[PDB]
Design a binder for these strands. Structure first.
Ligand code: K
Ligand code: MG
Ligand code: MG
Ligand code: MG
Ligand code: MG
Ligand code: MG
Ligand code: MG
Ligand code: MG
Ligand code: MG
Ligand code: MG
Ligand code: MG
Ligand code: MG
Ligand code: MG
Ligand code: MG
Ligand code: MG
Ligand code: MG
Ligand code: MG
Ligand code: MG
Ligand code: MG
Ligand code: MG
Ligand code: MG
Ligand code: MG
Ligand code: MG
Ligand code: MG
Ligand code: MG
Ligand code: MG
Ligand code: MG
Ligand code: MG
Ligand code: MG
Ligand code: MG
Ligand code: MG
Ligand code: MG
Ligand code: MG
Ligand code: MG
Ligand code: MG
Ligand code: MG
Ligand code: NA
Ligand code: NA
Ligand code: NA
Ligand code: NA
Ligand code: NA
Ligand code: NA
Ligand code: NA
Ligand code: NA
Lengths: 399, 180
RNA sequence: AAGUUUGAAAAGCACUUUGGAAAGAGAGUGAAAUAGAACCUGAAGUCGUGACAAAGACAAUGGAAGUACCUCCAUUUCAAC
RNA sequence: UCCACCGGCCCCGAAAAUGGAUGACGCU
RNA sequence: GAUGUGGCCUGGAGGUUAGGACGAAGCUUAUGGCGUGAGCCUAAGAUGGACCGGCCUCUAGUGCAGAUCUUGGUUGGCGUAGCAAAGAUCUAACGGAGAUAUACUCAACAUGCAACGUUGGAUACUGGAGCGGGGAAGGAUUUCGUGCCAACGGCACUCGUA
RNA sequence: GGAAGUCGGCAAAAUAGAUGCGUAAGUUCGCAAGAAGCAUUGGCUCUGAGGGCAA
RNA sequence: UUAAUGAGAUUCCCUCUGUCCCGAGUUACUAUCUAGCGAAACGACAGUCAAGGGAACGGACUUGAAGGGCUAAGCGGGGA
RNA sequence: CGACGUCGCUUUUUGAUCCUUCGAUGUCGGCUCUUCCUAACCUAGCGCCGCAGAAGACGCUAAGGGUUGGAUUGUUCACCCACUGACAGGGAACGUGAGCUGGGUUUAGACCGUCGUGAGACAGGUUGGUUUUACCCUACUUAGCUGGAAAUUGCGAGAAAAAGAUUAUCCGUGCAAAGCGGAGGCGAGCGGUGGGUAGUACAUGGUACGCUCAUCACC
RNA sequence: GUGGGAUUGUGAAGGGAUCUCGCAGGUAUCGUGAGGGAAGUAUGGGGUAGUACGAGAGGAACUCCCAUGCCGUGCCUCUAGUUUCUGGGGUUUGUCGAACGGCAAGUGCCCCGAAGCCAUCGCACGGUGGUUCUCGGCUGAACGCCUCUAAGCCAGAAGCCAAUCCCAAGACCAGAUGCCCACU
RNA sequence: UACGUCCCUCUCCAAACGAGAGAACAUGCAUGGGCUGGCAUGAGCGGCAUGCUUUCGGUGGGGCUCGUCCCGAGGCGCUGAACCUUGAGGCCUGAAAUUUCAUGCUCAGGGACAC
RNA sequence: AUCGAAUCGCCACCUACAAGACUGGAGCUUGCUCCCUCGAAGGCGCCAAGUAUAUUCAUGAUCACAAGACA
């Protein structure tokens, strides 16, 4: 008979436990349409940092129609992935079972370190017997039989892809063992999927071959961790009055007399953050090329200044974006340096917002350390001019 | 380490042989790639040659693309029992947000740990000058940097270090040096 | 509160050994040091240890009937019996 | 064939708070 | 609730019969046998060290699981709660058993840690309504020197109002 | 934003020294009164005023 | 009835503010982990629920439904 | 909608009883938080009206979601201001005090009115009046280690496997077809790892690729 | 059988005998997904339109598309808050003879302050299929005729179920793999 | 037996402790340099001079001595200087640059399991 | 290699399928008549590899888990 308000938190994200993995993993793939061409559905990226952009909006009826807006964006570095294997799945009354794996003839050191805790001091025998066997005629026959089994019984075909940390030449991402994920091949018949996958073997796949610029994607990633947290932060319950004996930041009543136990719907202290999330409908604002190929990464048709996607001073705690990258509108779960998965969208992409063609007019590259007011180092140089240390440097130059 | 890499299990000879085998494998890869990249770059055109940036170790102020930096390190050998070096320690990076009444004793412990890791010594003695310098602005006013003189000596063989202050007017431009 | 009630005699453990010492390991005394000093006997409860039995979660204990394995127990039988 | 009336079995009349009770499953 | 029982059991007494250093009482039990049962009796102690069983009768402070029962001991909780006011110590040398304490390999790190008292130096606090210097009350050797660290100084001690 | 919190401004915030000016109702003429309010104070370099002894 | 006085009770106004909207960030000391030291309360036996009956609100009972063992930090629903 | 009659249902009121608790089950309200019910206020569909439209009335399925901010009051109730789609009603030991708070109620101090000769009384008013303990079990929340299908044992053999001299005695394909295609040693084949050399490819230090010498295996 | 241990308490040393246990798995990935959880929900504006209805006063709704509450899950580019980076300045009293360097006032105090954390105080994102109710129909008897039902069918609610989302093999996965070992 | 795993060690996307992600001579770590940023012009010295800047320009209310040289808050100049800038843990030694990084430390890793 | 076990029907003819208000097939008269493969057997296996001119069984002594089991 009391005053009413909704409960705190979403019981569908239970338990608030630490995620089993640090990598974002797709728990489902888009519905497979056999009418389309065979195509990959996912890609692993690394979060570098955030900035903001200006664009004009194409949305008739809106008060911002034909008007500039500024959008925060997230930059995710996407070095190409390497396809090392093919797996097939057959459907049974108890769910999908993998038929087998067709391994590539050659694997990178980075892929093989994933099988070790201490690679440098190990014997480094991973895949050696497999190489010596598959190379022969009995091995060729076994591979042919596995491929024929894929053709005969598989309804689902996925590729085994791994990341290239040597190409992701990042100093703070300490890991050197490649990240491995199964990427599902959608489109076409099963034979067509197998042909695409077999062509992909031992090859590099670039993020622009999986995703196009103005499309949207879903992001699988794990959120930033906070360790043990109380109910106020973890659940959003109210703080108690100042007058409260023995503590304020808690739930006053954790239950009625009956049931004579505590329900699972009551907010408790515990792990907060480090949870897996799937975060659909992130618009791709840009798929950039690596700076060693195209250094004018942040240049647009309206801002002719030559600049890269890296802000002055670098991304804080991350460094330089050296590879291909993806500009996503808004935010994604997880901190910088964390590997994440971009998945082709599962929700229907027919709204005006999701179909809108994105054209960037300005990309902010000012310092992310302390109220950056210069877009480029040349702008700062022309503000300040000759400083004392530059004069000393020239004085040394003349002698 | 694992059983197959333990010194007392393989012995000197086998440990050396396995080490040289790994090295010669890495070295064979490095030389093959060196020759291949040199000739592939040579027989390429100017548009492509400039398109390729510093692949074949062409660009200045770069690492050697072939190998690791530590593999290029010349291993002079055994350091002598008695050795002396002068080094700056960035104390403020170690003492940031530390309880004010603990700053100077913490600085003493951090200096002992720093030197002990540097010299493989657990007996690290603080000379009166260094303790006086660390404490000379009270318990919470430890200087952000200190230049210390480290003297290892011997007296099985027992190694210990004597750490003393080096008064400096400025810390700019000082790196780690060996003193005789 | 509290029996000094070791042992027939103090014969109250020389000497060796390692330990800073307390003590330990030996060796001696004694019929007996599980008689070594507020020392006869030395219970219950609780605990350590070795060997074994096993054992999901039916709280454990308990009844009744078997069975597997054990048994420092009893009794009987062992040839015209 | 329809008119009224009277039984049997079934149905409606038949709304409460933890998930639950022909004892359970189920049975036509 | 009443009553019966050549019914069981315990400490003493009058009788009568036995036993014990070739081991009494007590105590221990996968230690069997007997009894419906209270219990009795044997066996084994790699237990003990000096008294004691049976039977008839007499006698009483004569039988325990519980009384927020009495006294002693133990015990899970438990290596837990905690030992958080009065700001604080650092460094070298000396002293000390208190160490630089090691199987093979092993140069030293990764296999003796942590803690002491004194002197010197550094740093800080009390801040004269003082962790200053003297008295009453109260206490009564706590004073002093040397020695010593079993117990005590809720951590420690080579130190101490021990 | 400013008591909407709460039984209740509980708690906290706030005011602040000195100097000049200024200060209502009421009143036992003593007060009320630091009522309320307004203003000024640093540092330097100077100037003025405020004394004692002797012939 | 009363000026003055009041750690007395009450109402309103100005000022002011984390009292609140609606919470956020920082510190010391804890908790926490380690070395040394080391208690008490309490303790029939024990501890997963639903319904049913039942001294008319069960941890034990009936019928269902759960339940692999051992642990660290918390927490105040129940242990009427 | 419904007189006067009549039949229910519910335990959100109060009464009646006295069964449990008097070697103690913390007692009103608010705050906080979760859950449940429906006799439906709003939100979704649908009937019907005296239903022209707009606004509404009544009913049905529906409890998935939602159902405020304030003045006075200890209050629950109330009723006033205002917002709103709406400001529905209940249960959970009159949910919830080792969660709080302590305004009320309900000790001792004190004042009033009434009553009493009086000490004192009041179901009347007023003011002031200690809110204790979790380290155990379970529950819940997170957080580690770890056995295990005869749920620890039996040796107690069950594949959401293949398909054959009884899974042995070859590999592919094909319908569980018809057939069809490959399959003492030296040398050869096929490859794994090292030398020489040569483009090229890929994101461009590091792999793959053609030719030759070496070894290694399997055949 | 192989190996390693050990028997019961009264010395020593050799013999048996008997028990007990080990004798095949380790370690590193990618996955499956039974079961459980479960979430989105409202309002307004544009237009429909001042039109349908209506004497007139008055006066609607959906395709669509533009916002906004609430709730949920995140994030830190911006703006805001926070500072023991006691960062850089400034400033009071005391203090080392002075300047310097500072130091004390348990962070002296004041201004600005990166990084990090963080606010509906900022920013981003929140999806699809079945199956039924109530009810309305179709075909159609019982019962010539009729009838929505009785046997069949259709459409159908913010309901229920599943998908998407979160945990996930005591759900004991004979799912697929890398490398040693054992078997061979 | 072998692969290997863990502890010690190092890093921080993790974190009460366990656990996690990683690294295993690695620009790994350390210290410099440069960048990016914060504050707001350091100490010292000096006043048309061997100072500052590239021919210019160079105080102060007052006060004290014998035109000069002294005291004086503050001001000006060298000087967007001085200092700080990764640490619970910003960037650069892998695009280009009027500069875009340099050095030095490591010298058979140790231990336990696997057995 | 412990290890002695309890279990006692094999199969490459059952090891495909559907319906029971219509079961092999017809006919028209629609429940009877006519035809057939006639509507009630999965194949073997049970002591001569096949139905007969045979051929070793003891004393394991009258029951005992069959003292044996690749059918
Ligand atoms: K401790
Ligand atoms: Mg973190
Ligand atoms: Mg209180
Ligand atoms: Mg029944
Ligand atoms: Mg009786
Ligand atoms: Mg007596
Ligand atoms: Mg008595
Ligand atoms: Mg009794
Ligand atoms: Mg503790
Ligand atoms: Mg002081
Ligand atoms: Mg004093
Ligand atoms: Mg002590
Ligand atoms: Mg109010
Ligand atoms: Mg209120
Ligand atoms: Mg106050
Ligand atoms: Mg007046
Ligand atoms: Mg007044
Ligand atoms: Mg005033
Ligand atoms: Mg008063
Ligand atoms: Mg008073
Ligand atoms: Mg608050
Ligand atoms: Mg605690
Ligand atoms: Mg119950
Ligand atoms: Mg109970
Ligand atoms: Mg409790
Ligand atoms: Mg009671
Ligand atoms: Mg009680
Ligand atoms: Mg209670
Ligand atoms: Mg209470
Ligand atoms: Mg309270
Ligand atoms: Mg009071
Ligand atoms: Mg900030
Ligand atoms: Mg200070
Ligand atoms: Mg850390
Ligand atoms: Mg470069
Ligand atoms: Mg048998
Ligand atoms: Na003797
Ligand atoms: Na007793
Ligand atoms: Na403590
Ligand atoms: Na617990
Ligand atoms: Na009276
Ligand atoms: Na499920
Ligand atoms: Na800010
Ligand atoms: Na600020």
């Amino acid at each position: 008979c009391k005053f009413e308000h909704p409960r705190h938190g979403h019981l569908g994200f239970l338990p608030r436990k630490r995620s089993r993995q640090i990598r974002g993993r797709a728990r489902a793939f888009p519905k497979d349409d056999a009418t389309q061409k065979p195509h990959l559905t996912s890609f692993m990226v690394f979060k570098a940092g955030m900035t903001h952009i200006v664009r004009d909006v194409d949305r008739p009826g809106s008060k911002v129609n034909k008007k500039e807006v500024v959008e925060p964006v997230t930059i995710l570095e996407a070095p190409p992935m390497v396809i090392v294997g093919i797996v097939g799945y057959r459907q049974t009354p108890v769910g999908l079972k993998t038929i087998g794996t067709v391994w590539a003839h050659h694997t990178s050191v980075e892929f093989r370190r994933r099988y070790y805790k201490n690679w440098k001091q190990s014997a480094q025998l991973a895949f050696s017997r497999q190489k010596q066997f598959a190379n022969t005629k009995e091995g060729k026959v076994a591979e042919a039989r596995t491929l024929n089994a894929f053709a005969k019984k598989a309804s689902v075909i996925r590729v085994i892809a791994h990341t290239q940390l040597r190409k992701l030449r990042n100093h703070r991402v300490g890991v050197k063992k490649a990240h491995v994920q199964e990427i599902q091949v959608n489109g076409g018949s099963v034979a067509a999927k197998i042909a695409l996958a077999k062509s992909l073997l031992e090859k590099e796949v670039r993020v622009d071959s999986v995703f196009q610029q103005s499309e949207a994607c879903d992001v699988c990633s794990v959120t930033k961790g906070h360790g043990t947290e109380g109910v106020v932060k973890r659940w959003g319950v109210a703080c108690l009055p100042r007058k409260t004996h023995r503590g304020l930041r808690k739930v006053a009543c954790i239950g009625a007399w009956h049931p004579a136990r505590v329900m699972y719907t009551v907010a408790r202290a515990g792990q907060h953050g480090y949870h897996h999330r799937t975060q659909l409908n992130k618009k791709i604002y840009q798929i950039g090329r690596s700076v060693a190929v195209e250094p004018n990464q942040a240049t647009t048709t309206y801002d002719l200044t030559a600049k890269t996607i890296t802000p002055m001073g670098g991304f804080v705690g991350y460094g330089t974006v050296r590879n291909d990258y993806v500009m996503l509108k808004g935010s994604v779960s997880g901190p910088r340096r964390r590997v994440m998965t971009l998945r082709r969208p599962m929700a229907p992409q027919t709204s005006r917002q999701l179909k809108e063609k994105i054209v960037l007019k300005f990309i902010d590259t000012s310092s992310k350390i302390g109220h950056g007011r210069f877009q480029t180092k040349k702008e700062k140089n022309q503000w300040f001019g000759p400083l004392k240390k530059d004069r000393i440097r020239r004085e040394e130059r003349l002698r | 380490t694992r059983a197959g890499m333990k010194g007392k299990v393989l012995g000197k000879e086998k440990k050396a042989a396995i080490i040289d085998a790994r090295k010669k494998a890495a070295e064979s890869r490095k030389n093959r790639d060196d020759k291949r990249w040199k000739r592939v770059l040579a027989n390429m055109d100017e548009e492509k040659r400039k398109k390729f940036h510093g692949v074949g170790n062409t660009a200045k102020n770069s690492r050697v693309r072939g190998a690791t930096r530590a593999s290029l390190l010349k291993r002079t050998g055994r350091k002598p029992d008695a050795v002396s070096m002068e080094a700056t320690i960035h104390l403020s990076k170690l003492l940031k947000k530390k309880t004010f009444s603990k700053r100077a004793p913490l600085a003493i412990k951090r200096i002992k740990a720093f030197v002990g890791r540097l010299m493989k010594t657990k007996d690290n003695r603080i000379d009166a000058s260094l303790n006086t310098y660390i404490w000379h602005k009270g318990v919470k006013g430890v200087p952000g940097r200190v230049r210390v003189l480290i003297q290892r000596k011997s007296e099985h063989k027992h190694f210990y270090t004597v750490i003393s202050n080096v008064p400096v007017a400025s810390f700019k431009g000082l790196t780690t040096k060996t003193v005789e």
